[PDB]
Design a protein around this nucleic acid. Structure first.
Length: 30
DNA sequence: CCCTGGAGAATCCCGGTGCCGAGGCCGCTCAATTGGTCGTAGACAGCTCTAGCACCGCTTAAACGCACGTACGCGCTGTCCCCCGCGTTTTAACCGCCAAGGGGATTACTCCCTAGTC
Protein backbone atom coordinates (compact mmCIF):
# COMPACT_ATOMS: atom_id res chain seq x y z
CA UNK A 1 0.00 0.00 0.00
CA UNK A 2 1.48 3.32 -1.14
CA UNK A 3 -0.13 5.16 1.78
CA UNK A 4 2.01 7.88 3.36
CA UNK A 5 1.71 9.14 6.91
CA UNK A 6 -0.73 12.04 7.46
CA UNK A 7 1.05 15.20 6.36
CA UNK A 8 3.79 13.55 4.29
CA UNK A 9 2.21 14.77 1.04
CA UNK A 10 0.88 17.91 2.74
CA UNK A 11 4.21 19.76 2.64
CA UNK A 12 4.74 18.82 -1.01
CA UNK A 13 1.23 19.91 -1.93
CA UNK A 14 1.60 23.22 -0.05
CA UNK A 15 4.78 23.82 -2.03
CA UNK A 16 2.81 23.06 -5.20
CA UNK A 17 0.20 25.72 -4.44
CA UNK A 18 2.54 28.39 -3.09
CA UNK A 19 4.48 27.98 -6.32
CA UNK A 20 1.28 28.44 -8.34
CA UNK A 21 -0.58 31.71 -8.86
CA UNK A 22 -3.82 30.71 -10.63
CA UNK A 23 -7.47 31.22 -9.64
CA UNK A 24 -8.27 28.93 -6.70
CA UNK A 25 -12.05 29.57 -6.82
CA UNK A 26 -14.28 28.18 -9.56
CA UNK A 27 -15.69 31.09 -11.54
CA UNK A 28 -19.29 29.90 -11.93
CA UNK A 29 -20.13 29.36 -8.21
CA UNK A 30 -18.44 32.69 -7.48
C1' DC B 1 18.37 -1.81 20.04
C1' DC B 2 18.16 1.32 14.92
C1' DC B 3 20.25 1.19 9.33
C1' DT B 4 19.56 0.35 4.81
C1' DG B 5 19.04 -2.25 -0.59
C1' DG B 6 15.77 -2.14 -3.07
C1' DA B 7 11.75 0.02 -4.93
C1' DG B 8 8.05 3.41 -5.65
C1' DA B 9 7.52 7.80 -6.95
C1' DA B 10 8.06 12.89 -7.14
C1' DT B 11 11.64 16.61 -9.28
C1' DC B 12 14.67 19.12 -12.52
C1' DC B 13 15.45 19.62 -16.85
C1' DC B 14 15.98 20.50 -21.80
C1' DG B 15 14.14 19.10 -26.65
C1' DG B 16 10.35 20.29 -29.56
C1' DT B 17 6.33 21.66 -31.86
C1' DG B 18 2.17 25.13 -32.21
C1' DC B 19 0.21 29.60 -31.17
C1' DC B 20 -1.21 34.55 -30.46
C1' DG B 21 0.30 38.84 -29.24
C1' DA B 22 4.48 42.56 -28.16
C1' DG B 23 6.36 45.24 -30.66
C1' DG B 24 7.18 47.61 -34.69
C1' DC B 25 5.08 50.49 -38.55
C1' DC B 26 1.41 53.82 -40.50
C1' DG B 27 -1.80 57.97 -40.13
C1' DC B 28 -3.66 61.67 -37.77
C1' DT B 29 -3.59 64.87 -33.70
C1' DC B 30 -4.06 67.83 -29.83
C1' DA B 31 -1.57 69.73 -26.03
C1' DA B 32 3.14 71.74 -23.89
C1' DT B 33 6.28 75.79 -25.49
C1' DT B 34 6.23 80.61 -25.84
C1' DG B 35 5.40 85.81 -26.75
C1' DG B 36 3.42 89.17 -23.47
C1' DT B 37 0.70 91.11 -18.97
C1' DC B 38 -0.40 92.44 -14.14
C1' DG B 39 -1.03 91.69 -9.75
C1' DT B 40 -0.01 87.99 -5.88
C1' DA B 41 2.28 86.01 -2.50
C1' DG B 42 6.35 85.04 -0.21
C1' DA B 43 11.49 86.54 0.84
C1' DC B 44 13.76 90.27 3.67
C1' DA B 45 14.35 92.71 7.69
C1' DG B 46 12.35 94.60 12.18
C1' DC B 47 10.19 95.37 16.48
C1' DT B 48 8.60 92.80 19.70
C1' DC B 49 7.71 89.15 23.45
C1' DT B 50 7.83 84.88 25.63
C1' DA B 51 8.81 80.55 27.01
C1' DG B 52 12.95 77.97 28.54
C1' DC B 53 18.49 76.90 30.85
C1' DA B 54 20.67 76.59 34.34
C1' DC B 55 21.01 77.47 39.04
C1' DC B 56 20.07 77.22 43.99
C1' DG B 57 18.10 73.83 48.63
C1' DC B 58 14.51 70.54 50.09
C1' DT B 59 11.22 65.95 50.46
C1' DT B 60 10.34 62.25 51.37
C1' DA B 61 8.49 59.07 46.78
C1' DA B 62 10.36 55.59 44.32
C1' DA B 63 14.33 52.21 43.71
C1' DC B 64 17.01 48.57 44.95
C1' DG B 65 18.86 44.35 47.87
C1' DC B 66 17.72 40.46 50.84
C1' DA B 67 15.17 36.83 52.24
C1' DC B 68 11.15 33.86 52.29
C1' DG B 69 8.39 31.03 49.55
C1' DT B 70 5.68 29.04 46.46
C1' DA B 71 3.27 27.75 42.54
C1' DC B 72 3.38 27.53 37.25
C1' DG B 73 5.72 26.82 32.39
C1' DC B 74 7.48 23.21 30.99
C1' DG B 75 8.53 18.75 30.50
C1' DC B 76 7.53 13.75 31.79
C1' DT B 77 3.76 10.15 31.65
C1' DG B 78 -0.50 8.00 29.13
C1' DT B 79 -4.77 7.50 26.11
C1' DC B 80 -8.38 8.63 22.56
C1' DC B 81 -10.52 10.67 18.89
C1' DC B 82 -10.72 12.30 14.62
C1' DC B 83 -8.91 13.60 10.21
C1' DC B 84 -6.34 12.05 6.16
C1' DG B 85 -5.25 9.03 1.75
C1' DC B 86 -7.53 6.34 -1.15
C1' DG B 87 -11.53 4.21 -3.45
C1' DT B 88 -16.29 4.84 -5.39
C1' DT B 89 -20.08 7.87 -6.75
C1' DT B 90 -22.60 11.98 -8.38
C1' DT B 91 -23.42 17.09 -9.69
C1' DA B 92 -21.32 20.50 -13.30
C1' DA B 93 -20.26 22.92 -16.91
C1' DC B 94 -19.47 22.49 -22.51
C1' DC B 95 -20.26 21.16 -27.00
C1' DG B 96 -22.84 19.02 -30.37
C1' DC B 97 -28.12 18.13 -32.56
C1' DC B 98 -32.71 20.11 -34.54
C1' DA B 99 -36.43 23.56 -36.66
C1' DA B 100 -37.90 28.52 -36.54
C1' DG B 101 -38.01 33.53 -36.51
C1' DG B 102 -35.17 38.46 -36.77
C1' DG B 103 -32.92 41.02 -39.24
C1' DG B 104 -29.35 43.10 -41.91
C1' DA B 105 -27.77 43.40 -45.98
C1' DT B 106 -28.58 42.86 -50.81
C1' DT B 107 -30.36 43.23 -55.07
C1' DA B 108 -34.75 43.47 -58.51
C1' DC B 109 -38.99 46.08 -60.21
C1' DT B 110 -40.38 50.38 -60.78
C1' DC B 111 -41.43 55.25 -60.51
C1' DC B 112 -40.95 59.68 -60.04
C1' DC B 113 -36.73 63.30 -60.32
C1' DT B 114 -34.18 65.07 -64.21
C1' DA B 115 -33.72 67.28 -68.76
C1' DG B 116 -34.00 67.40 -74.76
C1' DT B 117 -35.99 69.38 -79.26
C1' DC B 118 -39.76 69.73 -84.19
Amino acid sequence: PHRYKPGTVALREIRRFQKSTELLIRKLPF
